[PDB]
Structures are given as structure tokens and as C-alpha cells.
Design an enzyme around this catalytic site. Structure first.
Site, PDB file in Angstrom:
ATOM      1  N   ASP A   1       2.484   3.328   3.334  1.00 34.33           N
ATOM      2  CA  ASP A   1       1.523   4.300   2.833  1.00 34.33           C
ATOM      3  C   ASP A   1       2.280   5.630   2.603  1.00 34.33           C
ATOM      4  O   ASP A   1       1.846   6.699   3.018  1.00 34.33           O
ATOM      5  CB  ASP A   1       0.262   4.432   3.684  1.00 34.33           C
ATOM      6  CG  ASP A   1      -0.847   5.242   3.041  1.00 34.33           C
ATOM      7  OD1 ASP A   1      -1.759   5.673   3.688  1.00 34.33           O
ATOM      8  OD2 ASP A   1      -0.776   5.406   1.742  1.00 34.33           O
ATOM      9  N   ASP A  58      -4.365   1.601  12.434  1.00 42.24           N
ATOM     10  CA  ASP A  58      -4.838   2.865  12.982  1.00 42.24           C
ATOM     11  C   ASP A  58      -5.674   2.596  14.217  1.00 42.24           C
ATOM     12  O   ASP A  58      -6.046   3.504  14.914  1.00 42.24           O
ATOM     13  CB  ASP A  58      -5.692   3.633  11.984  1.00 42.24           C
ATOM     14  CG  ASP A  58      -4.927   4.347  10.895  1.00 42.24           C
ATOM     15  OD1 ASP A  58      -5.537   4.955  10.038  1.00 42.24           O
ATOM     16  OD2 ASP A  58      -3.640   4.300  10.937  1.00 42.24           O
ATOM     17  N   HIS A 116       2.301   4.914  -2.701  1.00 39.82           N
ATOM     18  CA  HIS A 116       1.913   5.793  -3.791  1.00 39.82           C
ATOM     19  C   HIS A 116       3.118   6.521  -4.326  1.00 39.82           C
ATOM     20  O   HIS A 116       4.018   6.883  -3.535  1.00 39.82           O
ATOM     21  CB  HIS A 116       1.056   6.981  -3.300  1.00 39.82           C
ATOM     22  CG  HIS A 116      -0.242   6.575  -2.612  1.00 39.82           C
ATOM     23  ND1 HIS A 116      -1.399   6.313  -3.338  1.00 39.82           N
ATOM     24  CD2 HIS A 116      -0.500   6.378  -1.269  1.00 39.82           C
ATOM     25  CE1 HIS A 116      -2.326   5.994  -2.468  1.00 39.82           C
ATOM     26  NE2 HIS A 116      -1.826   6.001  -1.234  1.00 39.82           N
ATOM     27  N   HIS A 176       0.874  -1.156   0.000  1.00 42.73           N
ATOM     28  CA  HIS A 176       0.000   0.000   0.000  1.00 42.73           C
ATOM     29  C   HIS A 176       0.924   1.223   0.000  1.00 42.73           C
ATOM     30  O   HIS A 176       1.404   1.610   1.075  1.00 42.73           O
ATOM     31  CB  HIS A 176      -0.979   0.027   1.212  1.00 42.73           C
ATOM     32  CG  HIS A 176      -1.900   1.214   1.175  1.00 42.73           C
ATOM     33  ND1 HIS A 176      -3.291   1.081   1.222  1.00 42.73           N
ATOM     34  CD2 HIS A 176      -1.625   2.565   1.105  1.00 42.73           C
ATOM     35  CE1 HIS A 176      -3.817   2.327   1.174  1.00 42.73           C
ATOM     36  NE2 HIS A 176      -2.828   3.227   1.080  1.00 42.73           N
ATOM     37  N   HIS A 223      -9.282   1.340   2.053  1.00 42.71           N
ATOM     38  CA  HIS A 223      -8.961   2.437   2.978  1.00 42.71           C
ATOM     39  C   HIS A 223     -10.129   2.328   3.977  1.00 42.71           C
ATOM     40  O   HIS A 223     -11.300   2.183   3.597  1.00 42.71           O
ATOM     41  CB  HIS A 223      -9.019   3.861   2.325  1.00 42.71           C
ATOM     42  CG  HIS A 223      -9.128   5.000   3.343  1.00 42.71           C
ATOM     43  ND1 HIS A 223      -8.085   5.908   3.534  1.00 42.71           N
ATOM     44  CD2 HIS A 223     -10.161   5.348   4.160  1.00 42.71           C
ATOM     45  CE1 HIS A 223      -8.498   6.742   4.462  1.00 42.71           C
ATOM     46  NE2 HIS A 223      -9.735   6.450   4.864  1.00 42.71           N
ATOM     47  N   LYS A 246      -8.656  -0.624  -5.655  1.00 38.42           N
ATOM     48  CA  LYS A 246      -8.693   0.135  -4.396  1.00 38.42           C
ATOM     49  C   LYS A 246     -10.059   0.767  -4.201  1.00 38.42           C
ATOM     50  O   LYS A 246     -10.639   1.381  -5.103  1.00 38.42           O
ATOM     51  CB  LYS A 246      -7.580   1.212  -4.443  1.00 38.42           C
ATOM     52  CG  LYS A 246      -7.661   2.288  -3.370  1.00 38.42           C
ATOM     53  CD  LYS A 246      -7.311   1.754  -1.977  1.00 38.42           C
ATOM     54  CE  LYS A 246      -7.345   2.882  -0.949  1.00 38.42           C
ATOM     55  NZ  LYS A 246      -6.255   3.840  -1.218  1.00 38.42           N
ATOM     56  N   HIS A 253      -5.228   0.218   6.527  1.00 29.89           N
ATOM     57  CA  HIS A 253      -5.084   1.189   7.598  1.00 29.89           C
ATOM     58  C   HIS A 253      -5.488   0.553   8.927  1.00 29.89           C
ATOM     59  O   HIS A 253      -5.900   1.221   9.870  1.00 29.89           O
ATOM     60  CB  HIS A 253      -5.936   2.457   7.364  1.00 29.89           C
ATOM     61  CG  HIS A 253      -5.547   3.123   6.047  1.00 29.89           C
ATOM     62  ND1 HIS A 253      -4.294   2.929   5.483  1.00 29.89           N
ATOM     63  CD2 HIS A 253      -6.243   3.961   5.234  1.00 29.89           C
ATOM     64  CE1 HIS A 253      -4.259   3.642   4.338  1.00 29.89           C
ATOM     65  NE2 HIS A 253      -5.410   4.278   4.162  1.00 29.89           N
ATOM     66  N   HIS A 306       0.203   1.754   8.035  1.00 29.20           N
ATOM     67  CA  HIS A 306       0.465   3.118   8.490  1.00 29.20           C
ATOM     68  C   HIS A 306       1.602   3.135   9.513  1.00 29.20           C
ATOM     69  O   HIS A 306       1.754   4.072  10.285  1.00 29.20           O
ATOM     70  CB  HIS A 306      -0.814   3.717   9.095  1.00 29.20           C
ATOM     71  CG  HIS A 306      -1.618   4.411   8.054  1.00 29.20           C
ATOM     72  ND1 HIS A 306      -2.827   4.974   8.358  1.00 29.20           N
ATOM     73  CD2 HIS A 306      -1.370   4.639   6.745  1.00 29.20           C
ATOM     74  CE1 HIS A 306      -3.326   5.532   7.249  1.00 29.20           C
ATOM     75  NE2 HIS A 306      -2.451   5.351   6.274  1.00 29.20           N
TER      76      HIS A 306
END
Ligand SMILES: OCCc1ccccc1
Ligand SMILES: OCCc1ccccc1
Ligand SMILES: OCCc1ccccc1
Ligand code: NA
Ligand code: NA
EC number: 3.1.8.1
Lengths: 333, 332
Positions: B268, B200, B24, B22, B168, B136, B197, B221
Site C-alpha cells: 500500500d 490492520d 499506488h 494493492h 479498503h 476498488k 487492509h 499494510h
């Protein structure tokens, strides 16, 4: 006053503009959409061919230039504009600005940043094409949102620095024009640099004339928009209204009659592709008004003449007013 | 499925190696990078920054990254292909829709969206021929009506092609539960889905119950923390106040509960980020200078120190991603 107007094929002289439609679109979409899903329109080639047919028919009817008010968020594809402009031999003025569907990358920006983005599109070129915008499009749909006030302010700053005019989308019903004018004036923008669009969407003659008296240009650009006969199609009625083209067209004569012939701009607000609404809206619209962009010269102009509007006023509205509006004009010092 | 689609073409499963699932190259908006490249300095500056970071991640052992940028995250596949080639790191591109779809997307039906996702997976993104290797999707609390359509289309596209779905979530709101329900209502197998995520939240019960059902848990994350930046509200809101050690420990927790085969780890990270406040990129880079290399340079060693065995670390970073990414259709 500027001697040249930027088009997708380069600068043209004021006199080359001729009969101009000031609020139209080649395609009403979303940023990156046409390139990621061209099949939504059959194909990019099918859309270009449709646009070329329409532009050629409009040209046959006397249209020499159209102002494509598609912003980044309307999915403006300048390469497509350039291609169709060249193939149909019709001048196309591109726009910068932001409409009401800005993505996060735009919505989180400050007035200063947005100003830089509009300036980039007007002064240097859209994307990496060198094609410079000749107008700034903005919009509100009732009371402006905080982001919308920032966009209007940035639009005013870009217009003051370059002389390019600003044109808007409004909820004429709600009288959006007054709030828009307020914001623009707060930035020192001259009303003569601004066209309050979709003004024929309301019969409030009071609203229209008060704006005209302040110097604003009034955009009567939804003339052929009508869901009459399709009262059963909710999406269509919602978008097009239940007022007739003659009712809307009569507003042109009204404004002329009130003494504001020099502030009127007329258009069709047509398009060849439309993805930012329900599927099939294009077909519905094309059935409603088969003349498309040619509606103005083929039906509206004759209608007004039949109503007593003189030749010269008709010519002044379709040639003179657009030229004065589009000519880049900086405020006097 | 013996091959995974990347921006440079298909690779065999073994060639994926150590993979970050995950990430970008750039977090933006559709058409943004092409319309306002100066926002990132220049397109060239962004590409150069991305190549530097990918080369460093590669030096640390990363062989592949999955760029989960969708159309609405402003994914620019041409940029991905350029940086993948210049840095020599495999990059898997994504289809799907995140939380900022424009009207042209938001007004579409589940059937229409399904064909769009299939276009990206089967034929190619835009006119490039680069085919997506993942789908996604996202929710931020209970799904909106449109998000339910997106999740259903994602499941349909995954069932027809075998490519996995990654999400997400607003983890603390337990979004994975609603996501799983929607996916299951379409007949998608939990093994084709990564609930992202997930680090989190500190709610291990929510995570183990999803794991128990067969979902992959994305603890992506890890380096995200505003500890030391309390004074920065935007940064705080985005990164949280939990430490990277606290998040990394959830990987150990899941392993200890028997779900090592269901864990996917990532950072991420990104090289450009326009979809948030200006300057967020610099703040992030200061918080985590290692960027994408954080997982291999700090997290793996930390877990090892905490007792996680070699074999388990290799399975999580190599085996799990390979199994997930391998296109897999449901048995008849
Ligand atoms: O289908 C071709 C019809 C067409 C011919 C020439 C210009 C515009 C319309
Ligand atoms: O001089 C009057 C000619 C004219 C009429 C209508 C609008 C613009 C110009
Ligand atoms: O026993 C299989 C070894 C392995 C460990 C962790 C995750 C995937 C595979
Ligand atoms: Na210019
Ligand atoms: Na594929």
C-alpha cells in the site's frame, strides 16, 4: 486599475467586455468528471455543441462576455471553455477559488497553500494551458465551516496580490454575506473587490442594502430560477425556489431605488450541463427557462425598463458595473 | 480469462509474475495532479520518483503492481502508462469509487454507477483506451447509503466482466463482514473479492471466517508503522503502532490455518500523497525506505525464516494474484 481582463482567449481591454453576464457556467460538474464520464452529457461534443448554440443565441441578444464561475471543484474544464468561446465568439472569463465540494487534497490544505494554488491559476495559468483566471469564486451554505473560512481568507489574499475580484455563492436566506464580508475585511480586502452572489434568493431588503452601503457588489444572479409550476418536483423546488422571476427581478429596481445602482451585478446562473445534482435537472431547468443565458437581455432588461428603470441605468448595470468589477485593481498603498 | 488488462495493454496470465496487489503511483484527488502538480514538486519530479521506485521494486523481483487508485483517488492513467513504460513494470489500473466521491458521483444511482464502472473496464478510462483490471471500493465502519450503492454497482460490474473487486476496510471494525453481505446479496462470488487492509487487525477469527467463505484476504499494510513516531499524531493515526513483524506474522497465521490460497500481500505504497497532511510522504519514506520493494526484500525472507516454504511463498506472490486478476465470470 488594470487595463486588461484575462479571458480564455487571452487578455481583452476593458472596453471589449461590453454587456457581461457575471455569474454563469458552461457546465456545473465535478473535478475530472467531464473527462472520465463525458457520456453523462451525451458526449463531450454534444455538450460543446449545446453550449455553442446557447452562447450564439445569447450573443445574438447582445451578450458579449460571460464570467464562468466554475472552480476546480465545479469541474471547470478550461479547454472546453476556450473551445466554445472561440466557436461562438463570446468572451469567457475563467475562475479560480473553491466551491463547496472540495476533495480531500484540497480540504486538508492550509490558508498558505490554498493561496498559492489560487495565485497559480490567476498568474501562471490553469493546468498546463496558460489560461489565466480572471475571478476567484468561493462559497458558504450557512455558517462557514472551518475550511470555508480558510478558503475565504486565501481568496482575499490572492485578490489583494493580483487585483482580481472575488465572487461568492451564499445562502442568502441565512445572510451568509455578512459573515463573508467579515472574513474578507479581516484580511484587508476592499468590499469593491467582492460580489455577494445569489442575493436575489432572499427578499430581505435590509440585508442587501446594508451590504451595498459598505461597498459590496450585490449579485442578483438567479433571476430566471423558479420552480413555480413544478411544486410537485421536490428536487427542483429545493434548488430553484418558489419565488417568481419578476419577484427576483424587482430586487434590482429596489436596489436602484435605494441608490445602489453602481453596486448591482445581474446574471442568470445558467449552464449547459449539470452533473452535480439529480439526473435530469438540466432538462427541467431548460423547460423552465428556454431562453437560458439570454433571459437577462431578452426578458429582465425590458421588464425593468417597463418598470421605469432608465436606459442609462440599465446600460450602467450591464456594462459599466461588470467592467469596473472585473478590471484588476490593487488596493492603494 | 486468458488476459489481464494493464496500462500498456493486455498481458497473458503468466506474464504477471510476482505481483503487488494493492499499491499506488500517487494517492490524490480527481483532477488534483493536473491542476496543482507543484504540490508534488512537479509532474516530472513525481514521474521520476515513481520510475526510480518501480525500477528498484523490479530489481527485487516485482513484475506487476495493481494501482488501486480510483477516479476519486485522482488516478491519472496517463501517468501510470508513462511510468510503467519507463520502468518496465506492468501496472493494472482500477475503476470503482473510494471514500471521497464528488457530488457528481455521490448523487448517482446504482444503475448509473454500474455503467460508469463498466465504461472503465470495457471501453477505457477517460479517452485513453486503458481498461481497468480491478474495481476498488471502500467503507470505514458501517457503510453509508452511498457506499452500499457503490458496493452493489461494483458487484454488478464484476459479474458482467469477470474483473475482481478489492476493498479498503476499517479492519478493526470488521467491515469485511458487511462488505461480503452486500456482495453476496448481488450474487458475486467471494473468490472475486479481496477484503483489504486486513493486517490492520489482530482478530484472526474475523479473518479466518472470511477466508473460510472463500474471500481473499489482503494483508497489504505490512510496512505501515508509527513505531518511533509516537509524537506524530497524524502519522500515528494513519500507520498504527503495531510492527511490520506483527503484521507479517498474520500471513503465517493464515497459512497455518490452511488459507495460503486466499492470501494477497502488498505494501500500500505510493510516490506522491496529497489526500492527507502535507509532508506525510516524507514521513512514510523515512519509515520505509524500501517502499514497494519491502515485500520482496524483507517480508518474504522473514516468512521463510519463520518456516514458510518456498512453494508457499511463490504461490502467494505469483499464483494467488494471477488467479484473482484473471477475469472470471460466474458459471451459468
Ligand atoms: O440547431 C442550430 C440552431 C442554431 C443555429 C445558429 C446558432 C444558434 C442556434
Ligand atoms: O454615471 C451613472 C451611470 C451608471 C448607472 C448604473 C450603474 C453604473 C453606471
Ligand atoms: O499447491 C499450490 C501451491 C500454492 C501455494 C500457495 C498459494 C497458491 C498455490
Ligand atoms: Na493574471
Ligand atoms: Na476489460
Amino acid at each position: 486599475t488594470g487595463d486588461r481582463i484575462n479571458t480564455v482567449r487571452g487578455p481583452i481591454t476593458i472596453s471589449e467586455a461590453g454587456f457581461t453576464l457575471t455569474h454563469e457556467h458552461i457546465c456545473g460538474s465535478s473535478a475530472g468528471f467531464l473527462r472520465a464520464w463525458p457520456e453523462f452529457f451525451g458526449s463531450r461534443k454534444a455538450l460543446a455543441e449545446k453550449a455553442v448554440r446557447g452562447l450564439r443565441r445569447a450573443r445574438a441578444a447582445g451578450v458579449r462576455t460571460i464570467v464562468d464561475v466554475s472552480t476546480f471543484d465545479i469541474g471547470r474544464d478550461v479547454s472546453l471553455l476556450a473551445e466554445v468561446s472561440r466557436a461562438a465568439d463570446v468572451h469567457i472569463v475563467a475562475a479560480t477559488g473553491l466551491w463547496f465540494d472540495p476533495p480531500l487534497s484540497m480540504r486538508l490544505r492550509s490558508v498558505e497553500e490554498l493561496t498559492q494554488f489560487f495565485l497559480r491559476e490567476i498568474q501562471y495559468g490553469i493546468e498546463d494551458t496558460g489560461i489565466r483566471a480572471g475571478i476567484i469564486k468561493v462559497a458558504t451554505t450557512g455558517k462557514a465551516t472551518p475550511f470555508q473560512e480558510l478558503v475565504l481568507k486565501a481568496a482575499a489574499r490572492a485578490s489583494l496580490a493580483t487585483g482580481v475580484p472575488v465572487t461568492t455563492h451564499t445562502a442568502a436566506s441565512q445572510r451568509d454575506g455578512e459573515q463573508q464580508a467579515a472574513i474578507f475585511e479581516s484580511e484587508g480586502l476592499s468590499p469593491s473587490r467582492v460580489c455577494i452572489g445569489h442575493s436575489d434568493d432572499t427578499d430581505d431588503l435590509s440585508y442587501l442594502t446594508a451590504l451595498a452601503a459598505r461597498g459590496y457588489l450585490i449579485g442578483l444572479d438567479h433571476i430566471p430560477h423558479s420552480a413555480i409550476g413544478l411544486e410537485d418536483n421536490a428536487s427542483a423546488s429545493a434548488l430553484l425556489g418558489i419565488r417568481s422571476w419578476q419577484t427576483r427581478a424587482l430586487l434590482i429596481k429596489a436596489l436602484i431605488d435605494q441608490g445602489y445602482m453602481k453596486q448591482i451585478l445581474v446574471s442568470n446562473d445558467w449552464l449547459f450541463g449539470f452533473s452535480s445534482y439529480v439526473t435530469n435537472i438540466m432538462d427541467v431547468m431548460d423547460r423552465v427557462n428556454p431562453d437560458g443565458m439570454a433571459f437577462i437581455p431578452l426578458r429582465v432588461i425590458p421588464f425593468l425598463r417597463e418598470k421605469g428603470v432608465p436606459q442609462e441605468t440599465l446600460a450602467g448595470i450591464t456594462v459599466t458595473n461588470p467592467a469596473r468589477f472585473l478590471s484588476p485593481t490593487l488596493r492603494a498603498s
